[PDB]
Amino acid sequence: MASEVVLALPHKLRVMRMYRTGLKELINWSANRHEWYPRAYALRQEFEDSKALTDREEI
Amino acid sequence: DANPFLRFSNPRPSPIDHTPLLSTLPETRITTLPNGLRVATEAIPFAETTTLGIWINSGSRFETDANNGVAHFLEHILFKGTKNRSVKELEVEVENMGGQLNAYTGREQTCYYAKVMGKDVGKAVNILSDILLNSNLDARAIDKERDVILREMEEVNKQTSELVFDHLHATAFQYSPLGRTILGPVENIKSINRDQLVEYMKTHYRGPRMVLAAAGAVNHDELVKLASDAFGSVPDEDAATSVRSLLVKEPSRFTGSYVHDRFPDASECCMAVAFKGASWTDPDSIPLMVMQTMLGGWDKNSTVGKHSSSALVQTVATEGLADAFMAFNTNYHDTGLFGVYGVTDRDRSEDFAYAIMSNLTRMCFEVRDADVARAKNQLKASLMFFQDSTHHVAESIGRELLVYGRRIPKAEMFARIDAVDANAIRAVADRFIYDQDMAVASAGDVQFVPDYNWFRRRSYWLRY
Amino acid sequence: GGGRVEVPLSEKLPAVTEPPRTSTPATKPIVQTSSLRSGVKVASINTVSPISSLVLFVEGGAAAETPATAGASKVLEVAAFKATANRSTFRLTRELEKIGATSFARAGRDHVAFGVDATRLNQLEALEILADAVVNARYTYWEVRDSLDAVKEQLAAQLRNPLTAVNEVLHRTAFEGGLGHSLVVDPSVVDGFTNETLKEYVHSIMAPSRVVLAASGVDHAELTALATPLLNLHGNAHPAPQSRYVGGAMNIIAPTSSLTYVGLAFEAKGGAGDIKSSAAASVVKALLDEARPTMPYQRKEHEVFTSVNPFAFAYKGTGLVGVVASGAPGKAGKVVDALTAKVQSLAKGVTDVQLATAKNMALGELRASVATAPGLAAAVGSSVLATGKFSANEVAAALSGLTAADVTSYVNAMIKTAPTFVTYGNLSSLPRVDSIAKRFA
Amino acid sequence: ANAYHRTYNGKPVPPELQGADYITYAGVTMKKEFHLFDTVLSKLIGAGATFTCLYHFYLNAEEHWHGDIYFFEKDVQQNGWD
Amino acid sequence: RMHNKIQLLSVLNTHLVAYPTPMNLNYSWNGGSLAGMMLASQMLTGILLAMHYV
Amino acid sequence: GFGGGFLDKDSVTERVLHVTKHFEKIDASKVSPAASFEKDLGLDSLDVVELVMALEEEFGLEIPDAEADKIASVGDAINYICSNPMAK
Amino acid sequence: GVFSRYYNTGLLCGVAVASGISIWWYNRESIYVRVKSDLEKEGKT
Amino acid sequence: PIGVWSVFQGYVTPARLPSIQTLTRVGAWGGVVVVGGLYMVQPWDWLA
Amino acid sequence: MPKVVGFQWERYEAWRHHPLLQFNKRNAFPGVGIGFAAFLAYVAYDKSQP
Amino acid sequence: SDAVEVFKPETGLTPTNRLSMAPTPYIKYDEHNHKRFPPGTEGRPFAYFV
Amino acid sequence: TSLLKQVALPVFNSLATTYRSVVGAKLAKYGLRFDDLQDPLKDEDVAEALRRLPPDVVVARNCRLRRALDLSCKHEALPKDLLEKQTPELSYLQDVLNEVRAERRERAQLGAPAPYTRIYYD
Numbered sequence A: 001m002a003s004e005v006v007l008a009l010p011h012k013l014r015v016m017r018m019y020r021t022g023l024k025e026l027i028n029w030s031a032n033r034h035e036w037y038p039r040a041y042a043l044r045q046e047f048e049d050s051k052a053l054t055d056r057e058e059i
Numbered sequence B: 001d002a003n004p005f006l007r008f009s010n011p012r013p014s015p016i017d018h019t020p021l022l023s024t025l026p027e028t029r030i031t032t033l034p035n036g037l038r039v040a041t042e043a044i045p046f047a048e049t050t051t052l053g054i055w056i057n058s059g060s061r062f063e064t065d066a067n068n069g070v071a072h073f074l075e076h077i078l079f080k081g082t083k084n085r086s087v088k089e090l091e092v093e094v095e096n097m098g099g100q101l102n103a104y105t106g107r108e109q110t111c112y113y114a115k116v117m118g119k120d121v122g123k124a125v126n127i128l129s130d131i132l133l134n135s136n137l138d139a140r141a142i143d144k145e146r147d148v149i150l151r152e153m154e155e156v157n158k159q160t161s162e163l164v165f166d167h168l169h170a171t172a173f174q175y176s177p178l179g180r181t182i183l184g185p186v187e188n189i190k191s192i193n194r195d196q197l198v199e200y201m202k203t204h205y206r207g208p209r210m211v212l213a214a215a216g217a218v219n220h221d222e223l224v225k226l227a228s229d230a231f232g233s234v235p236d237e238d239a240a241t242s243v244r245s246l247l248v249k250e251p252s253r254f255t256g257s258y259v260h261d262r263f264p265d266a267s268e269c270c271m272a273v274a275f276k277g278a279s280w281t282d283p284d285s286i287p288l289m290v291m292q293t294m295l296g297g298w299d300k301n302s303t304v305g306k307h308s309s310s311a312l313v314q315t316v317a318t319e320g321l322a323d324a325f326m327a328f329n330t331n332y333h334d335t336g337l338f339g340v341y342g343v344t345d346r347d348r349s350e351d352f353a354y355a356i357m358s359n360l361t362r363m364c365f366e367v368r369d370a371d372v373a374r375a376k377n378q379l380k381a382s383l384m385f386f387q388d389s390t391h392h393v394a395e396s397i398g399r400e401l402l403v404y405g406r407r408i409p410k411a412e413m414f415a416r417i418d419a420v421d422a423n424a425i426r427a428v429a430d431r432f433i434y435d436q437d438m439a440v441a442s443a444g445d446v447q448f449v450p451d452y453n454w455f456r457r458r459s460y461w462l463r464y
Numbered sequence C: 001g002g003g004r005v006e007v008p009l010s011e012k013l014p015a016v017t018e019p020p021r022t023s024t025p026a027t028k029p030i031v032q033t034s035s036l037r038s039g040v041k042v043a044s045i046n047t048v049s050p051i052s053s054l055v056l057f058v059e060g061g062a063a064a065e066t067p068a069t070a071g072a073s074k075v076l077e078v079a080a081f082k083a084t085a086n087r088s089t090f091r092l093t094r095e096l097e098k099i100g101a102t103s104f105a106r107a108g109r110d111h112v113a114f115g116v117d118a119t120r121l122n123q124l125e126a127l128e129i130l131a132d133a134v135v136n137a138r139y140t141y142w143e144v145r146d147s148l149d150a151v152k153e154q155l156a157a158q159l160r161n162p163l164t165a166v167n168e169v170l171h172r173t174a175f176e177g178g179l180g181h182s183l184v185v186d187p188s189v190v191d192g193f194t195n196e197t198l199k200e201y202v203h204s205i206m207a208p209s210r211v212v213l214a215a216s217g218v219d220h221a222e223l224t225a226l227a228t229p230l231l232n233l234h235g236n237a238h239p240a241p242q243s244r245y246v247g248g249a250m251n252i253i254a255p256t257s258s259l260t261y262v263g264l265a266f267e268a269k270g271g272a273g274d275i276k277s278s279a280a281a282s283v284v285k286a287l288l289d290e291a292r293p294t295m296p297y298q299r300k301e302h303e304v305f306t307s308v309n310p311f312a313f314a315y316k317g318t319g320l321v322g323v324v325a326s327g328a329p330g331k332a333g334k335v336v337d338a339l340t341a342k343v344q345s346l347a348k349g350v351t352d353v354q355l356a357t358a359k360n361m362a363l364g365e366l367r368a369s370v371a372t373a374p375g376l377a378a379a380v381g382s383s384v385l386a387t388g389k390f391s392a393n394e395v396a397a398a399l400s401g402l403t404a405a406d407v408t409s410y411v412n413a414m415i416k417t418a419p420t421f422v423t424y425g426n427l428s429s430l431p432r433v434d435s436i437a438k439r440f441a
Numbered sequence D: 001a002n003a004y005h006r007t008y009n010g011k012p013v014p015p016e017l018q019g020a021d022y023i024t025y026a027g028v029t030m031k032k033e034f035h036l037f038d039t040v041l042s043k044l045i046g047a048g049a050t051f052t053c054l055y056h057f058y059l060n061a062e063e064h065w066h067g068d069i070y071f072f073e074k075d076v077q078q079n080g081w082d
Numbered sequence E: 001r002m003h004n005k006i007q008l009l010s011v012l013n014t015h016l017v018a019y020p021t022p023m024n025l026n027y028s029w030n031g032g033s034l035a036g037m038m039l040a041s042q043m044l045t046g047i048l049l050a051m052h053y054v
Numbered sequence F: 001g002f003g004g005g006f007l008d009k010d011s012v013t014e015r016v017l018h019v020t021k022h023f024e025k026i027d028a029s030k031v032s033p034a035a036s037f038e039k040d041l042g043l044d045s046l047d048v049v050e051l052v053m054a055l056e057e058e059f060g061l062e063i064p065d066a067e068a069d070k071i072a073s074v075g076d077a078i079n080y081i082c083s084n085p086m087a088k
Numbered sequence G: 001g002v003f004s005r006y007y008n009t010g011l012l013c014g015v016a017v018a019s020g021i022s023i024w025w026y027n028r029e030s031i032y033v034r035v036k037s038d039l040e041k042e043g044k045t
Numbered sequence H: 001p002i003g004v005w006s007v008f009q010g011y012v013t014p015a016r017l018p019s020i021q022t023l024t025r026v027g028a029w030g031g032v033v034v035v036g037g038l039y040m041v042q043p044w045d046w047l048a
Numbered sequence I: 001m002p003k004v005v006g007f008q009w010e011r012y013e014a015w016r017h018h019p020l021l022q023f024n025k026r027n028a029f030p031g032v033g034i035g036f037a038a039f040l041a042y043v044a045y046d047k048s049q050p
Numbered sequence J: 001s002d003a004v005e006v007f008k009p010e011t012g013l014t015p016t017n018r019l020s021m022a023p024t025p026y027i028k029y030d031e032h033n034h035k036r037f038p039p040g041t042e043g044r045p046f047a048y049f050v
Numbered sequence K: 001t002s003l004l005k006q007v008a009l010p011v012f013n014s015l016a017t018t019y020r021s022v023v024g025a026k027l028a029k030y031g032l033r034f035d036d037l038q039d040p041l042k043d044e045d046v047a048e049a050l051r052r053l054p055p056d057v058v059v060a061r062n063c064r065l066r067r068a069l070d071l072s073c074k075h076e077a078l079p080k081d082l083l084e085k086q087t088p089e090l091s092y093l094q095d096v097l098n099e100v101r102a103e104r105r106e107r108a109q110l111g112a113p114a115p116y117t118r119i120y121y122d
């Protein structure tokens, strides 16, 4: 779970900061940027599987 | 044995498969607007009438101590004139579409709806949006309704069952938001004004908490267009002020307690005993529905009460313990209530109390399979009867989108009901009933009602 | 444990509607009617609803009662669906409660109706239970003797409402013959009742040409094929006391009535048989609707009235359209004057907006009566018993095709006919009866 | 014919094919039936096999829990050699 | 309900279980039960002593 | 019984219709005798193959590949079944 | 059939545990000594 | 007419008889009286 | 993550899970209880006491 | 049924009539002899162990 | 075994007729019928079946019972002219009691108890 300030972020901004911090952590767990590239591509793709979601409960 | 009069039917309770009834049941379409408001329709193929309205995830729970009673006062004020239509203009326009407007305000849910014909869908949408968004909230009408509410409060003008249930909610949910009455105290009515009504509607009547549900003869795309034109201007909701954050911030608490409201020269003796039940999202809520069907209900205008399937109905009808009774299963967002309410007099109140307690505790130990099959069939048949009236279809659409988050299909509901057996009933009764605290409420001639220790002792058996 | 699936989450895949949808029908279903070889008429209408309703309409009611069998229809409402030749009361109650079905017995002023409502999967069980409880009923001594008490409190509670008493006395004053008999009788009328009285009444009212089987959401060929061996009835048609409209006036003395009730009525010519006259009478009933509660907590204030309640009953061959208005005990003459002024202003002409509003109110009532399956089955059965056909489409066409000139002519012809006048309450203020029935002349 | 009847298309299940003798699931009906001789003979044979195994085992449980080496060395040490 | 079927259960229930009593009784209202218990004690110990006294 | 190893037209039609409605895209009222798969029911080639396999299961048939390729509508499948002495 | 990596982990753990059991078995005292010691324990009851 | 008259008339069916769970819960009182007697007498290590 | 594509088959033959089309544990080991009772009686009659 | 015809109360804003029309969730018990636990305290009571 | 069933049938019928004749000859000296021997305090099915009767039948039964008890107190019998009119095998309670017992049998096969209890006087 995020912090209370992040809880106050707009849905768009909340998801944006989520993805940004996820990339940051993947760098943090990465051995190298070179290792981070395919992880970055996969992380981008995973969000792409959720682009067309409408039901706010499942979102 | 009669050949034609004795086939096809027998009194042995057997499970019935309701699967072929699912082939022709209609489908629900849901569209979410950018406002956050969901538009959900269910088209019945040859319907001539339409029920449509606005269901709101708000009510008396989400008020404060200072403005308790604002949501109930809102349905007194809202139909008294808008900024675009007067009282007579609204009356004429509603009369010409041949329907009636109606409103209910619960502890957690509010609806304003219209039962019209199929040709008056857009007019009903426009009228409902006009009262909801552009109301006058005139101070003269507020003063004209305050005195009437104060007179009916001074007269104690209330139903007996509503009086008992309000006492029950007040003593079972002490120091939590669910213990307040919908009506509110006398002082808040004596000091109500237009500002509190405006602030309540501005805070709580927002996009993610509102469902526009229509059933009967209605097209989904046209209702989407009409709702985007009319209800498109409702404010969105902050993430910090959602319904879940308010539920977390002020949670429900159950306290085992006792209250009676004694009157010096009353005739009846109404009483309710409830246990802490399940919330709406608990998967044990379906067995509680089956158990409530197993307990049933009865009133003395029926004469076949001695041939009932339910043992509690049989006991009360045969021995004449009560004039009427009913088992209830109330579900809220984070708690619930399960129990029996009945009307008796002072000489039969203890025996009725014993019958209630003995039949509640008996479900933990001995449950036969015939009763469970009978109650499952009766509950599925009761669910099919609600599908016959478009008002109940629209009410169920609004309620299910507000409190489950989704429209539960009929196949899933039948499958969840059919998964209940006698072991599940024994387990759920053991979880909720056995050796637990209960809440007791009574009103009227209640000098012979047993105290709390008598009720607490009879929640368990010393012989097993 | 058992199922632990949260209801916000979907339950597992075997909670599917894998049984596919039946294709919907091309057109709105029509009413199909026929007659059994015993003479019982069977009419049914198919629906897409999952509820099947079966109702049995028998000519009778208060119109078929005698002074010996007085109040037998009200007793038959309670004593129905009890022990038959094939089943006991316990077995019938358990067979109804096993499939979740509900039963009713409902007595009108010219008919008695028995019905069972169930789901579409148990229509054979509902039909068999209904036919066995109607045809082969026993009416034992002890069951009728024990039901008489509950009959007495149900009649005593139904007579607490002054509108029921005003309706009874109005039907007594308006008609001579069958329709003038009392439906909601006094409790002391049935004090000497026995099962022989009920058996005599049932033997009088039952005949194959006076029984109609109506069904909603049931296939017609299947229903006739499976109800032919069940509704093979025998018996003789007891003579019917045909009623005639004569008018007049009466009074009621009520010792502790806090208000005072005044009834005014006229005859709807043609009864339920004429579509256009019944439609015009329904439009007149809607035009007399002064305070219709279309909104919550709305306070329409009248100068004199406390309540206005019109009606339009359409029996066989004759009807009774009118209005009942309350008022203060000291303002009863003002209530009479205001009612006469309202009927006279109706006779002076209706103005477009009122005509459209009353037509929409009548159409809304007509369509909301047949919205559910039991209401549709009751409407089909009553219309077939009274006329021989169901004509809701023709009634809607008659309601929509009504002009203001036709309604004005209808009210003008109504006010020429002699009216019916009934008062109620601790009557301590009243204009004289000769001047009461003069304002329409 | 087939002990299982299939209905298809949500057809109304035949009334003659309903009752305690018919149990339906997913619109498909199966019959609750019992066979006397079959069940009795099955019980007899199963009981015979079970008792055979139980009694043979109880006669030879020591020669299983401990080893033959262990049991017979125990007998030799405790109950003589000759 | 079960004490309604036997007389001895009904008398015992009425006079020992469900007998109404003032709620403000203090400990000065315990002398009667103590006197009854002391009578029962005297009877038991006396019956036991009578098997050895001559 | 009936048929020289062949079943009736009517039960075949009913079984085919009952099998046909097992798709999310399918509205029930549009399934009828001799119905186009692609043009009417809007089912892809994968759906047609799945329906062929499902009907093979329902009637217990091992359809030859060319005959399966000939199957492109409801009526064709029904008439093919009405030619099979090996269908149960 | 089925592909359970849990089965693989179980196989490996069982291999290790049974190797340890074999090692435990290798150093045990004589069966004669064990029986005589138990008879000492059986002679004091 | 309580006793053998109830079974002669056919009032004792497979139904209205106690269930297996009811008989087990009643049958669990057999250990209580055994433990109570062993507590009262205390014949320690008396089992053969 | 949608899975309902192309004639979902689980639901098509879900009728195969008919309770009377299942593996009955009531008669899985018939006669075993009587055999156990007989073995117990034989043991108590022969080996235990005498 | 209505409470005016069944319970037949006195008319007025007496202390009993105020709680009859709108009961309060802030029930105050007497705490001279026993102090209450916090409301909504769950769990099987410790008095069984004692 | 239905063969031997029908076989006892006539022996059972013969002993039943002989018993009924002897007891009815004993019964008619007090004016009693066979149905007058059944006691509501002894049998709750009789107590329920007696509640289902019209009141004139109950009055006639109570009169016969009081007449027989008076005769027993007097150690006398009926006069011969009155004794010749007695019909001790005339049934007034048999069909009602049979239907009550059939109802109690039908309820017991589904698990339901009887809707009437024993009679308690306390």
Ligand code: HEM
Pocket: E028, E029, E030, E031, E032, E033, E035, E036, E039
């Ligand atoms: C074996 C001797 C006695 C027994 C077992 C006995 C028993 C009882 C009991 C159980 C009560 C009810 C509660 C109570 O007040 O403690 C009672 C009350 C009473 N007893 Fe005693 N009692 C005995 C002797 C006496 C004597 C010797 C007297 C007076 C000379 C007496 C006078 C009373 C009175 C007046 C009451 C009623 C007091 C009240 O309820 O306020 N009793 N007795």
Ligand code: HEM
Pocket: E039, E042, E043, E044, E045, E046, E047, E049, E050, E053
């Ligand atoms: C069924 C009831 C009783 C029986 C059988 C009984 C029997 C006896 C016997 C056999 C003795 C002589 C043994 C001895 O001296 O230790 C004795 C002594 C005595 N008993 Fe009881 N007794 C009964 C009840 C009572 C009661 C109700 C009282 C009431 C005050 C009482 C007061 C005494 C006294 C004062 C003595 C003399 C004790 C002494 O100083 O040694 N007894 N009793």
Ligand SMILES: CCCCCCCCCCCC(=O)SCCNC(=O)CCNC(=O)[C@H](O)C(C)(C)COP(=O)(O)O
Pocket: F043, F044, F045, F046
């Ligand atoms: C044990 C498993 C062994 C391996 C099995 C093989 C697994 C590999 C599968 C992956 C490779 C493919 O999908 S093979 C690639 C298939 N897709 C295409 O070729 C592009 C679309 N071209 C078309 O012509 C039509 O759309 C078409 C969809 C073909 C027809 O559908 P319709 O006629 O309705 O229109």
Ligand SMILES: [Zn+2]
Pocket: B072, B073, B182, B183, B184
């Ligand atoms: Zn309110």
